[PDB]
């Protein structure tokens, strides 16, 4: 009955800075501590075994060191390819009584300059219109922060409850991000209106893409 | 050189049974501690079971006596009996080699496969264009992609032109609607002037309803 208390759930920082993660162990594992990054999509990797053991192929700006049983993952100079969630793992001898145990992970974001997304406009196909069902799409890409407040209009008139969004992992290059917001509606509601627009709001810019029915 | 392949897994009704298998590739998994690790959707993960070179199991608290870990030997391959599935039994189970004679910890993993212990219904994707427009699309660069709506359950892999077409590829995650069905899109960013000349096809993929979808972007005229 061991147990890995991890720290912090999840850190921001820019690329240089040194960050740290925290495991904290029930009981004693001696040095059988290991650390794993995983990116998404993907299964972990081994960082770091026997406390402050480097693994093969891994950069030596990750480190490990121990003191007792509090046990510290250090990332010396942040790179934009450190954008994962980082787990420590605990073996008290041969895991017995639940002496296998993982960390609560850290997910670690990057701080980067501002950058403002390219705004491309996808009004719902025909084959879509077939079946009653309207889906208009509102495309962000490479844009930072994460922050974007996307809104929609149907000939002028604010929507609410009506889209919804989604966002990709933090780009491992550029440290950047994609939004897609989708606006769903009824066949009716679409013929009933005849200009659409999403507006990105990034500080103090506020960009909208439009298209109206028919035309074009 | 040296690979775990999983497979099965997909959709199971809440008290059904389930058999996930891991091929190994490169080295005998007879002669390692070998074992089964999950993560539910959006969160840690969660050690499952183990199993040791001489074949004596270790389980978990909640999977004690449900699950049964195995390998055959002759075709080298791990095994994940699960029998008395629950809601909280949906997660990306992992296959992964433990080495306990040197690092003390996991040195090879697989890719995960989704379980998804739900009483809901397998249905199929509807993939709809999403159709690049005319050369007034910020430049020289244009977006087109696929919407693909209403399918259950996860997961879905889509690709463009077979695997050829990957710089400036978004797939972005699905989205729980209030109707219970997923949807996602995909989005890929071209020159606008390789519209007309170089076809755009995404191929969605669906194992849990063996359906594929191959749907070519046609650039969409005015007039």
């Known amino acids: 009955a061991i147990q890995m208390t991890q720290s912090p759930s999840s850190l921001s920082a820019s690329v240089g800075d040194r960050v740290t993660i925290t495991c904290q162990a029930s009981?004693?594992?001696?040095?059988?501590l290991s650390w794993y990054q995983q990116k998404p999509g993907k299964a972990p990797k081994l960082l770091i075994y026997?406390?402050?053991s480097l693994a093969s192929g891994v950069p030596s700006r990750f480190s490990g060191s121990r003191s007792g049983t509090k046990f510290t993952l250090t990332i010396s100079s942040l790179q934009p390819e450190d954008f994962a969630t980082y787990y420590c793992?605990?073996?008290?001898?041969?895991?017995?009584?639940?002496?296998?145990?993982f960390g609560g992970g850290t997910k670690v974001e990057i701080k980067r300059t501002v950058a403002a997304p390219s705004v491309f406009i996808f009004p719902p196909s025909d084959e879509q219109l077939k079946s009653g069902t309207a889906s208009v799409v509102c495309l962000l890409n490479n844009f930072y922060p994460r922050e974007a407040k996307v809104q929609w209009k149907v000939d002028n008139a604010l929507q609410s409850g009506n889209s919804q969004e989604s966002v990709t992992e933090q780009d491992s290059k550029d440290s950047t991000y994609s939004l897609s917001s989708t606006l769903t509606l009824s066949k009716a509601d679409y013929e009933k209106h005849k200009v659409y627009a999403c507006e990105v709001t990034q500080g103090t810019t506020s960009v909208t893409k439009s298209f109206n029915r028919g035309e074009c | 050189e040296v690979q775990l392949v999983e497979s099965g897994g997909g959709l199971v009704q809440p008290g059904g049974s389930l058999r996930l298998s891991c091929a190994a590739s490169?080295?005998?998994?007879?002669?390692?501690?070998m074992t089964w690790v999950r993560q539910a959707p959006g969160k840690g993960l969660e050690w499952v079971s183990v199993?040791?070179?001489?074949?004596?199991?270790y389980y978990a608290s909640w999977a004690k006596g449900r699950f049964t870990i195995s390998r055959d030997n002759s075709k080298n391959t791990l095994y994940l009996q699960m029998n008395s599935l629950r809601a909280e039994d949906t997660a990306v189970y992992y296959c992964?080699?433990?080495?306990?004679?040197?690092?003390?910890?996991?040195?090879?993993w697989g890719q995960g496969t989704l379980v998804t212990v739900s009483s809901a219904s397998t249905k199929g994707p509807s993939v709809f264009p999403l159709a690049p427009s005319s050369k007034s699309t910020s430049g020289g660069t244009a977006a087109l992609g696929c919407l693909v709506k209403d399918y259950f359950p996860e997961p879905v892999t889509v690709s463009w032109n077979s695997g050829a077409l990957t710089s400036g590829v978004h797939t972005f995650p699905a989205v729980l609607q209030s109707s219970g069905l997923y949807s996602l899109s995909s989005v890929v960013t071209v020159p606008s002037s390789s519209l007309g000349t170089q076809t755009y096809i995404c191929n969605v993929n669906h194992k849990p309803s063996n359906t594929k979808v191959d749907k070519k972007v046609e650039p969409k005229s005015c007039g």
């Open positions: 992964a080699r433990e080495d306990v004679a040197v690092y003390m910890a996991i040195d090879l």
């Open positions: 490169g080295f005998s998994l007879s002669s390692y501690y």
């Open positions: 199993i040791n070179v001489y074949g004596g199991t």
């Open positions: 009981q004693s594992i001696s040095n059988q």
């Open positions: 026997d406390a402050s």
């Open positions: 793992l605990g073996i008290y001898g041969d895991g017995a009584d639940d002496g296998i145990a």
